[PDB]
Amino acid sequence: AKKVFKRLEKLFSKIWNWK
């Protein structure tokens, strides 16, 4: 399936570190 969406959640975590 196209649930790469999960990997996107990980990248979102990195944004929290920069935020």
Side-chain angles (χ1 to χ4, degrees):
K2 65 256 222 216
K3 65 231 140 119
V4 183
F5 190 85
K6 239 221 77 203
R7 273 112 91 171
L8 224 61
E9 268 173 292
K10 198 149 210 167
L11 263 168
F12 210 115
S13 168
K14 235 223 115 223
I15 309 180
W16 266 41
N17 230 332
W18 245 140
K19 181 264 282 217

